[PDB]
Enzyme design. Sequence first.
Site, mmCIF file in Angstrom:
data_model
loop_
_atom_site.group_PDB
_atom_site.id
_atom_site.type_symbol
_atom_site.label_atom_id
_atom_site.label_comp_id
_atom_site.label_asym_id
_atom_site.label_seq_id
_atom_site.Cartn_x
_atom_site.Cartn_y
_atom_site.Cartn_z
ATOM 1 N N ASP A 125 0.609 -1.326 -0.048
ATOM 2 C CA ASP A 125 -0.416 -0.280 0.170
ATOM 3 C C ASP A 125 1.244 1.186 -0.074
ATOM 4 O OD1 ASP A 125 -1.900 1.780 -0.033
ATOM 5 O OD2 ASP A 125 -2.212 1.087 2.435
ATOM 6 N N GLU A 167 -2.754 10.130 -1.343
ATOM 7 C CA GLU A 167 -3.560 9.611 -1.205
ATOM 8 C C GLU A 167 -4.140 9.075 0.008
ATOM 9 O OE1 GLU A 167 -4.247 5.751 -0.222
ATOM 10 O OE2 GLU A 167 -6.541 5.943 -1.587
ATOM 11 N N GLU A 168 -3.117 9.313 0.869
ATOM 12 C CA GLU A 168 -3.577 8.517 2.327
ATOM 13 C C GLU A 168 -4.491 10.001 3.672
ATOM 14 O OE1 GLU A 168 -3.768 5.728 3.031
ATOM 15 O OE2 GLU A 168 -2.585 3.896 2.623
ATOM 16 N N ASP A 214 -3.634 -0.669 -6.412
ATOM 17 C CA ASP A 214 -3.609 -0.781 -5.038
ATOM 18 C C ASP A 214 -3.868 -1.692 -4.116
ATOM 19 O OD1 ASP A 214 -3.501 0.657 -2.956
ATOM 20 O OD2 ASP A 214 -5.603 2.232 -3.198
ATOM 21 N N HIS A 296 -3.008 -1.419 6.764
ATOM 22 C CA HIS A 296 -3.377 -0.067 7.889
ATOM 23 C C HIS A 296 -2.715 -1.040 8.973
ATOM 24 C CE1 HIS A 296 -4.798 3.250 5.741
ATOM 25 N NE2 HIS A 296 -4.700 2.425 4.491
HETATM 26 ZN ZN LIG Z 1 -3.711 2.941 2.807
#
Ligand SMILES: [Zn+2]
Length: 327
Positions: A125, A167-168, A214, A296
């Site tokens: 990720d 992105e995060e 992704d 995550h």
């Molecule tokens: Zn992520």
Amino acid sequence: AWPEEKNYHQPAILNSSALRQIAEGTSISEMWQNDLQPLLIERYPGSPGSYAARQHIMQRIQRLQADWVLEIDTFLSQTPEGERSFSNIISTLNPTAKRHLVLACHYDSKYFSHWNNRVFVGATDSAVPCAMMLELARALDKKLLSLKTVSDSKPDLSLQLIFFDGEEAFLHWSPQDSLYGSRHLAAKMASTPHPPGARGTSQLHGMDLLVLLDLIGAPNPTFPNFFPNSARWFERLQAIEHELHELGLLKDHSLEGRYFQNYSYGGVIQDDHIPFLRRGVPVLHLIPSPFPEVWHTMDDNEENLDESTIDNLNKILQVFVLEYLHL
Ligand SMILES: [Zn+2]
């Protein structure tokens, strides 16, 4: 007229010997050492790793023979932490070609406070997607170099890579705290004429298809066929996977444990494709469902990646890209 060409575009399908050539032309060990490992670092926006990741990606593209044009799309935005700078990396072959197939992922990593002297490096990720894109550029370099040659005998179509920053979410995911780079770039492209000097058409019209990678790298991923307007391209991925399997060109791979699925998905996933999809760009969203078990967590690391899975996916993606571009 030309913006409709994508709707009728067909792949030039590779034969068995071509498939074997492509399968042997990619090196998972070389990607691991040269493309992936340098990215397994903390790389949230503005961090030393953000700069290093950017240098690494650019450097790896620059060493290749194909005529890549690199552009750093840098901008400022407010965030929950105060103003920050974000830099999308765009790498384009034939920038004035009206159409591009676009491969993309995010290169930023999500910020976490350090946990038992462990740092979040977001291996799936999305360090692995970044590395897959870089390995694709390398493995296909000679074929892609042919695009530098001008011919009336082929559609006005080439290849672009986008590595999105930001992105995060910095804190909790919200429309305002996420997708910084992709929301910025989609808006920019929407307002930019393409080809230069054109009336009406924008750079978004030039995007044949956005193939967004992704959360790739975990064993036994299952990718849903998310969208009807890209379902025929998704089905090509299934067919490539099946044929590569039948030809004995995949590793540790079974038909029962295949990656690309018939079924769709009952929710809406927020990701970098959103600002593009909402403006009408066709999207092939190569994100698995469910997300990797390590999603995550500090366990989203090198140890938990699966070499064979990534190698297999590299082969499938590379065949897809060659077939799309008629190379
Ligand atoms: Zn992520």
